[PDB]
């Protein structure tokens, strides 16, 4: 329900990569689940069980 | 049992006097740069308490002395003095002086400031919990991933040394520590001749498998989980963790740092990491520099290490 | 040449019709542990036809998604890659596993392993060179190969192994030396052909690696010397490899610091690229014993040599190293009947440079 790029507008490469890595690693504990359809596109953040 | 003091003089990176402020009670992280002398410090620590350095031909031993400034150093000095406060060592001395002196041909020991031969140390170290037979609890650089996939024969020998009854509760300790490390994991030891390790994570239903097929990061978790299980069942002197978490993610790094903090109270865990995640769980840090072909050791405050490893220092 | 996309179905820890995202000149892959991060590297190495025993698998029967849990998902599984160069020749390679064996496909056509390897070697990528695929533990191992087989590495990369099997017996049919003289001048032809082929690889890589490692370390003091033993017949015994660190003099390689040693490997890994340049390099956590003060130099070298000479995809965990990469595709797991793994792809070159 929460997108990514619109909160990543005014950021540099380092912090953007760090927060993308955090977004990708937080799913390992099924906290937030993500679904992608187009290879280079935004994904909304829908929390998991 | 208690690494109190270490003295190095021309072993492999510190040509001159390198007297160090005595170690912490619980945990010690040694941050530094590349080509500085962190591993050589750990190799010095285990040079007096691990057999497999002096068993080779006098070629690696000859090159094991500092020759970077020209002539080889006459005396390669490494000393660590222990603390038998809990009377774990057979010698009832509050401050036991233990050291190995090596030169061009010398390979001898000094115990409480007297000369002695190598033959006198194995009994006292084994009675103190030191496992000189195997490189247990002294995990080297990048080797944390081979203990997990080791064949069942090696694990059976390890548990036999650690005999026929101190394994059922070791399995329970491994279960509890592994669920502590991984909230969703359900690994368990199984006794067949050999012992298997039914590893699992995030499935919790039927994902029990065999150790070899696990990922390259889960292997480090399994290996250190077995080490910590052996610790919880039976205390061990201390632990040298040289880049114990260079392969696993920061998520487990926090999950191993907090629980090593919960485990540092009983025994000392001297470690080394370039990631800030593991250094939050110590009291007295360290910093190893490399200048003018003579390295140096100096204690650094917490914020100094945090600044050193938080971002690039180029 | 650079990969565009890879389709994986029912391979190791992979389920679904998902397709790997596009690859760029320098694209990094990151993610958590147990997420099948090397599984992408596993597929990239699998479509090259390995010996199927260094992927933490046995007898090629458990490569199926969730096979070693007692309930394999299915039996049909495949991994396919595409490849292209300047000219949009979108060639396609693929491998399928069925029953207890496998079949090979090129542009969706059953192709024997002989023709498969023949088509592969036509791009400069070899089948058993082992010279661009590095695993988790290989990074510190590719720096310290046993020279007795580093010689074999240099021999096979030099396109010279196909005569080695007919080389040695020649010697044993000289010792028997009318006919003896004409046997004598019927012996040195293969000798000198293999000799100058091995050298054409050897002095080329040796004279380029010093500049490569100097560029890697941006220091004049650091250098790398690659010399054989018995230079008259350099391809028999081990190829001695030595390097002089910025702060250290000439010392044995096997006792080098873990920080520089990997760099040495990278230098060597980026030196054998001089002779028969491989289309792409994949790096599986070369960031093992590398500090934030040294991954920067390697990353800068990769950036400057990734848009001019070749392409590189890296597995890494340190935030600094994969920050520099143009793209940062990732891999993440997911709960299910088995340990599901699937790939998430983003981009960074659109975002502004780090401040
Ligand atoms: N034969 C198999 N079939 C299906 N799934 C498997 C198989 N072997 C392992 N897995 C699953 O996939 C994972 C393998 O991951 P892999 O070996 O690619 O590591 P990785 O993601 O690169 O990890 P890291 O870099 O953190 O060490 C295991 O953790 C397990 O969950
Ligand atoms: N036998 C030796 N004598 C003298 N110096 C040596 C010897 N072996 C290695 N060195 C040097 O000691 C320095 C410290 O290396 P060290 O063993 O501490 O590295 P490491 O801990 O494995 O790696 P890193 O610190 O980069 O993570 C390096 O410059 C290395 O070249
Ligand atoms: Mg991995
Ligand atoms: Mg090191």
Swiss-Prot record, chain A:
Q: Which residues carry this modification: Phosphothreonine?
A: 46
Q: Where in the cell is it found?
A: Cytoplasm, Cytosol; Nucleus
Function, as annotated, reads: May promote apoptosis.
Q: What is this protein called?
A: 64-kDa C-terminal product
This chain is encoded by the gene named: RAD21
Range within the parent protein: 578 to 626 of 631
Curated annotation (Swiss-Prot), chain B:
Q: How is it modified after translation?
A: Ubiquitinated by the DCX(DCAF15) complex, leading to its degradation.
An example of a Pfam family matching this protein is SMC_hinge
Q: Which sites bind ATP?
A: 32-39
Locations listed in the record? Nucleus; Chromosome; Chromosome, Centromere
InterPro entries the UniProt entry points to: P-loop_NTPase (IPR027417), RecF/RecN/SMC_N (IPR003395), SMC (IPR024704), SMC3_ABC_euk (IPR041741), SMC_hinge (IPR010935), SMC_hinge_sf (IPR036277)
Report the residues modified as N6-acetyllysine. 105-106, 140, 289
Q: Which residues form the signal peptide?
A: none
Q: What is the effect of changing residue 105 to A?
A: 20% loss of sister chromatid cohesion, no effect on cohesin complex assembly
The miscellaneous annotation reads: Mutated Cornelia de Lange cell lines display genomic instability and sensitivity to ionizing radiation and interstrand cross-linking agents.
Query: What is the stated purpose of this protein?
Result: Central component of cohesin, a complex required for chromosome cohesion during the cell cycle. The cohesin complex may form a large proteinaceous ring within which sister chromatids can be trapped. At anaphase, the complex is cleaved and dissociates from chromatin, allowing sister chromatids to segregate. Cohesion is coupled to DNA replication and is involved in DNA repair. The cohesin complex also plays an important role in spindle pole assembly during mitosis and in chromosomes movement.
* Quaternary structure (record): Forms a heterodimer with SMC1A or SMC1B in cohesin complexes. Cohesin complexes are composed of the SMC1 (SMC1A or SMC1B) and SMC3 heterodimer attached via their SMC hinge domain, RAD21 which link them, and one STAG protein (STAG1, STAG2 or STAG3), which interacts with RAD21. Also found in meiosis-specific cohesin complexes. Found in a complex with SMC1A, CDCA5 and RAD21, PDS5A/SCC-112 and PDS5B/APRIN. Interacts with NUMA1, and forms a ternary complex with KIF3B and KIFAP3, suggesting a function in tethering the chromosomes to the spindle pole and in chromosome movement.
In its UniProt entry, what is this protein called?
A: Structural maintenance of chromosomes protein 3
UniProtKB/Swiss-Prot annotation, chain C:
* Residue sites binding ATP per the record: 31-38
User: What outcome is documented for mutating residue 317 to F in this protein?
Assistant: In CDLS2; uncertain significance
Give the coiled coil ranges: 103-123
Any idea where this protein resides? Nucleus; Chromosome; Chromosome, Centromere, Kinetochore
- SUPFAM superfamilies reported for this sequence: P-loop containing nucleoside triphosphate hydrolases, Smc hinge domain
Source domain of life is Eukaryota
The cross-references to CDD domains, in alphabetical order and at most eight, read: ABC_SMC1_euk
A Pfam family recorded for this sequence? SMC_N
Modification(s) after translation = Ubiquitinated by the DCX(DCAF15) complex, leading to its degradation.
Q: What does this protein do?
A: Involved in chromosome cohesion during cell cycle and in DNA repair. Central component of cohesin complex. The cohesin complex is required for the cohesion of sister chromatids after DNA replication. The cohesin complex apparently forms a large proteinaceous ring within which sister chromatids can be trapped. At anaphase, the complex is cleaved and dissociates from chromatin, allowing sister chromatids to segregate. The cohesin complex may also play a role in spindle pole assembly during mitosis.
> Which family is this protein grouped under?
Belongs to the SMC family. SMC1 subfamily.
Read off the domain note: The flexible SMC hinge domain, which separates the large intramolecular coiled coil regions, allows the heterotypic interaction with the corresponding domain of SMC3, forming a V-shaped heterodimer. The two heads of the heterodimer are then connected by different ends of the cleavable RAD21 protein, forming a ring structure.
PANTHER family assigned: STRUCTURAL MAINTENANCE OF CHROMOSOMES PROTEIN 1A, STRUCTURAL MAINTENANCE OF CHROMOSOMES SMC FAMILY MEMBER
Q: Which disease is it linked to?
A: Cornelia de Lange syndrome 2: A form of Cornelia de Lange syndrome, a clinically heterogeneous developmental disorder associated with malformations affecting multiple systems. Characterized by facial dysmorphisms, abnormal hands and feet, growth delay, cognitive retardation, hirsutism, gastroesophageal dysfunction and cardiac, ophthalmologic and genitourinary anomalies.
Q: What is this protein called?
A: Structural maintenance of chromosomes protein 1A
């Amino acid at each position: 329900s929460i997108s990514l790029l619109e909160l990543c507008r005014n950021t540099n490469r380092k912090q953007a990569a760090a927060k993308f890595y955090s977004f990708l690693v937080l799913k390992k504990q099924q906290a937030i689940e993500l679904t992608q359809e187009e290879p280079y596109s935004d994904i909304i953040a829908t929390p998991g069980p | 049992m208690y690494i109190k003091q270490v003295i190095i003089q021309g072993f492999r990176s510190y040509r001159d006097q390198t007297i160090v402020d005595p170690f912490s009670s619980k945990h010690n992280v040694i941050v530094g740069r590349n080509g500085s002398g962190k591993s050589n410090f750990f190799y010095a620590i285990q040079f007096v308490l691990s057999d497999e350095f002096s068993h080779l031909r006098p070629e690696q031993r000859l090159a094991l002395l500092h020759e970077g400034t020209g002539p080889r150093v006459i005396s390669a000095f490494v000393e660590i003095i222990f603390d038998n406060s809990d009377n774990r060592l057979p010698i009832d001395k509050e401050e036991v002086s233990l050291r190995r002196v090596i030169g061009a041909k010398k390979d001898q020991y000094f115990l409480d400031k007297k000369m002695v031969t190598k033959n006198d140390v194995m009994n006292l170290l084994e009675s103190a919990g030191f496992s000189r037979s195997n490189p247990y609890y002294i995990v080297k650089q990048g080797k944390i991933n081979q203990m997990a996939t080791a064949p069942d024969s090696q694990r059976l020998k390890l548990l036999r040394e650690v005999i026929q009854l101190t394994f059922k509760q070791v399995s329970k300790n491994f279960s509890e520590v592994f669920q502590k490390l991984v909230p969703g994991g359900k690994a368990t030891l199984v006794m067949k001749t050999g012992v298997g390790i039914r590893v699992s994570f995030t499935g919790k239903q039927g994902e029990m498998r065999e150790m070899q097929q696990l990922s390259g990061g889960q292997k480090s978790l399994v290996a250190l989980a077995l080490i910590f299980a052996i610790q919880k069942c039976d205390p061990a002197p201390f632990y040298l963790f040289d880049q114990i978490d260079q392969a696993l993610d920061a998520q487990h790094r926090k999950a191993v740092s907090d629980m090593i903090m919960e485990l540092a109270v009983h025994a000392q865990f001297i470690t080394t990491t370039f990631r800030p995640e593991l250094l939050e769980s110590a009291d007295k840090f360290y910093g190893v520099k490399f200048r003018n072909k003579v390295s140096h050791i100096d204690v650094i405050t917490a914020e100094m290490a945090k600044d050193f490893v938080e971002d690039d220092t180029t | 040449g650079f990969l565009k996309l890879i389709e994986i179905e029912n391979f190791k820890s992979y389920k679904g019709r998902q397709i790997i995202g596009p690859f760029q000149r320098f694209t990094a892959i990151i993610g958590p542990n147990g997420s099948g991060k090397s599984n992408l590297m596993d597929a990239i190495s699998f479509v090259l036809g390995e010996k199927t025993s260094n992927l933490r698998v046995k007898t090629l029967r458990d490569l199926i998604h969730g096979a070693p849990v007692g309930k394999p998902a299915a039996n049909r599984a495949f991994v396919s890659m595409v490849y292209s160069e300047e000219g949009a020749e979108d060639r396609t390679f693929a491998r399928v596993i069925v029953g207890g064996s496998s079949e090979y496909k090129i542009n969706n056509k059953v192709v024997q392993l002989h023709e498969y390897s023949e088509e592969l070697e036509k791009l400069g990528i070899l089948i058993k060179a082992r010279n661009f695929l590095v695993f988790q533990g290989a990074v510190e191992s590719i720096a310290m190969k046993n020279p007795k087989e580093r010689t074999a590495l240099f021999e096979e990369i030099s396109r010279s192994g196909e005569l080695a099997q007919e080389y040695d017996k020649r010697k044993k049919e000289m010792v028997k030396a009318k006919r003896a003289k004409k046997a004598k001048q019927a012996f040195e032809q293969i000798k000198k052909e293999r000799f100058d082929r091995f050298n054409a690889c050897f002095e080329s890589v040796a004279t380029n690696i010093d500049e490569i490692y100097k560029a890697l370390s941006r220091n004049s003091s650091a250098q790398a010397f690659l010399g054989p033993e018995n230079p008259e017949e350099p391809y028999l015994d081990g190829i001695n490899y030595n390097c002089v660190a910025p702060g250290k003099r000439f010392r044995p390689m096997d006792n080098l610091s873990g920080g520089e040693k990997t760099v040495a490997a990278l230098a060597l890994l980026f030196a054998i690229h001089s002779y028969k340049p491989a289309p792409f390099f994949v790096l599986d956590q070369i960031d093992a014993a590398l500090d934030n003060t040294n991954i920067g130099k390697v990353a800068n070298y990769i950036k400057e040599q990734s848009t001019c000479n070749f392409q590189a995809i890296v597995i890494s965990l340190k935030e600094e190293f994969y920050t520099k990469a143009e793209s940062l595709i990732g891999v993440y797991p997911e709960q299910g009947d088995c340990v599901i793994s699937k790939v998430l792809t983003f981009d960074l070159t659109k975002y502004p440079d780090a401040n």
